Amino acid sequence: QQYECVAEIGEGAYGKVFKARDLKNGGRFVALKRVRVQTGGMPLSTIREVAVLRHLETFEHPNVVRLFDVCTVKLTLVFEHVDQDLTTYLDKVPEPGVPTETIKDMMFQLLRGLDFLHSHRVVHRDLKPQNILVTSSGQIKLADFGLAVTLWYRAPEVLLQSSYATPVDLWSVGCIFAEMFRRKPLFRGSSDVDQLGKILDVIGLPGEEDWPRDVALPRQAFHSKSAQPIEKFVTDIDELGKDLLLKCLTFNPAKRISAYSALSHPYFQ
Numbered sequence: 628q629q630y631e632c633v634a635e636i637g638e639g640a641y642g643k644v645f646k647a648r649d650l651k652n653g654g655r656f657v658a659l660k661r662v663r664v665q666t667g668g669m670p671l672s673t674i675r676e677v678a679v680l681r682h683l684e685t686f687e688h689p690n691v692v693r694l695f696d697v698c699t700v701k702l703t704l705v706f707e708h709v710d711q712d713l714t715t716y717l718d719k720v721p722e723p724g725v726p727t728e729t730i731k732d733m734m735f736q737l738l739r740g741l742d743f744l745h746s747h748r749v750v751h752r753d754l755k756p757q758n759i760l761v762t763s764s765g766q767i768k769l770a771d772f773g774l775a776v777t778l779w780y781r782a783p784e785v786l787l788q789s790s791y792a793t794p795v796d797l798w799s800v801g802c803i804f805a806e807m808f809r810r811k812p813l814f815r816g817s818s819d820v821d822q823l824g825k826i827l828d829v830i831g832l833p834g835e836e837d838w839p840r841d842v843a844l845p846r847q848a849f850h851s852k853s854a855q856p857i858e859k860f861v862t863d864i865d866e867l868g869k870d871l872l873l874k875c876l877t878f879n880p881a882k883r884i885s886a887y888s889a890l891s892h893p894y895f896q
């Protein structure tokens with residue numbers, strides 16, 4: 628065999644990720660993701676999703692994890708190995724937290740890799756610090772995308788089950804943006820209705836025209852009254868970071884800022 632697994636990195640709905648030894652490339656560390664596929668025979672939606680992943684590899688974007696090899700048997704993906712994710716970085720950073728300019732750089736690399744995905748019509752749909760990898764040199768690399776439970780980073784339209792477009796990932800970016808300063812999740816709910824309730828306690832109840840129609844939860848189901856200043860939960864944030872954070876934490880996904888427009892925000896000057 629060409630690879631040799633040495634440890635398990637994690638398992639879940641994505642599959643099972645292993646830390647492996649690239650026996651034919653000098654023994655470098657790699658990440659093997661095995662995923663079973665119900666053959667009949669392989670589903671066309673899975674074959675098409677792999678072609679998009681190899682096409683996205685041709686660009687070799689620095690803010691997405693590298694795809695080295697693809698093997699078949701039921702489906703093994705060989706990615707470059709990153710030593711830690713975002714949670715491990717936030718847990719190990721000394722006091723009083725992440726440097727202010729380090730947050731700006733990591734948020735910029737996050738938006739670059741996300742804009743690269745949205746430019747090719749790819750929605751991450753599950754952006755969270757657990758799948759945001761931090762290179763030993765400090766680079767941000769996105770992982771676990773393109774292949775089809777914490778609700779703390781779900782967009783309001785996902786909790787309401789209405790729309791699932793690219794603004795879904797920008798809401799998660801806002802939740803991660805606040806967690807940069809807080810080093811603890813901003814909206815930490817225990818259910819679908821609980822997560823949406825703690826969201827509306829901060830950003831306030833949106834207008835009746837902003838609430839999606841033909842959803843189970845109506846606007847009257849929540850009495851969250853008014854909004855609160857964001858600097859109460861996210862201390863040490865500046866004016867430019869506050870304006871960018873609020874444009875990501877917009878209820879209406881149509882009024883939410885895009886990853887492309889977020890790259891040109893005055894916060895990155």
Ligand SMILES: CCN1CC2(C1)CN(c1ccc(Nc3ncc(F)c(-c4cnn5c4[C@H](C)CCCC5)n3)nc1)C2
Nearest residue numbers: 636637644658706707708709710711712757758770771
């Ligand atoms: C406290 C103990 N916990 C175990 C853990 C902290 C070690 N900490 C971690 C994460 C990623 C990697 N390294 C890596 N390198 C390349 C990759 F491509 C991937 C990858 C690809 N897909 N996914 C992953 C990860 C398992 C993240 C979850 C989404 C699924 N991971 N090492 C360590 C998770």
